[PDB]
Design a protein around this ligand. Structure first.
Ligand SMILES: [Cl-]
Ligand SMILES: [Cl-]
Length: 218
């Protein structure tokens, strides 16, 4: 259980859905961090009592440190850059913050079966994959109590909330997962009384029964 969460990369879709779910179903105090949030995030997610908004980029150490000051857990919505990741890890270090949950992409460790892997890496810019790899590596090299969530291909559907967790090293066969399902997974991890399964682990999140060669048109 946590009370104070800081969400980095707060304008991202999963980050916004997470914020809404935390406001509706918990008593958590939420600090949102990012560039021009008051204009990129809707009024129904921002004007609320338990939301504190701090504007800034990952290259503003002062603003970033303010945002994570007294956080009990930090959610990193986008792990796209080694540089951004190092800045985050440093800020957490300086403020004695230990617990972090971050979102990465499935596939980096060659865990997708052949066809899904080839389709995936032909439908992503190389620079994007490279940056995700570097961010992942920086976080793994830290001493943080991290949980990396390796997400397969995302889509939106409020009626799809089912997910399964795929341990590191296991073949990851699910070609898709809804953002709503990922948010449920994050919610459930935030409510885990025993954190051991999530302690410095990298866990795949997928929609059960989507063993396809590519994500569906859904
Ligand atoms: Cl953002
Ligand atoms: Cl997203």
């Amino acid at each position: 259980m946590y009370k104070y969460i800081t969400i980095l990369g707060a304008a991202g879709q999963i980050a916004q859905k997470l914020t809404a779910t935390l406001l509706t179903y918990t008593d958590m105090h939420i600090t949102l961090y990012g560039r021009q949030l008051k204009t990129r995030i809707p009024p129904e997610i921002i004007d609320h009592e338990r939301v504190t908004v701090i504007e800034g980029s990952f290259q503003n150490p002062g603003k970033l440190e303010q945002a994570v000051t007294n956080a009990e857990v930090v959610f990193v919505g986008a792990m796209e850059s080694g540089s951004d990741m190092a800045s985050i890890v440093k800020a957490l270090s300086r403020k004695n913050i230990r617990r972090v949950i971050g979102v990465s992409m499935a596939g980096l460790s060659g865990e997708f079966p052949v066809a899904l892997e080839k389709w995936t890496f032909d439908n992503l810019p190389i620079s994007y994959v490279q940056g995700e790899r570097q961010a992942r590596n920086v976080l793994r090299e830290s001493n943080l109590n991290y949980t990396i969530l390796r997400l397969t291909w995302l889509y939106n559907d409020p009626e799809k909330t089912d997910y399964e967790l795929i341990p590191e090293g296991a073949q990851f066969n699910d070609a898709q997962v809804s953002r709503e399902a990922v948010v449920k997974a994050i919610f459930d991890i935030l409510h885990a009384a025993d954190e051991t399964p999530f302690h410095r682990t990298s866990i795949g999140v997928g929609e059960p029964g989507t063993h396809y060669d590519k994500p569906s048109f859904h």
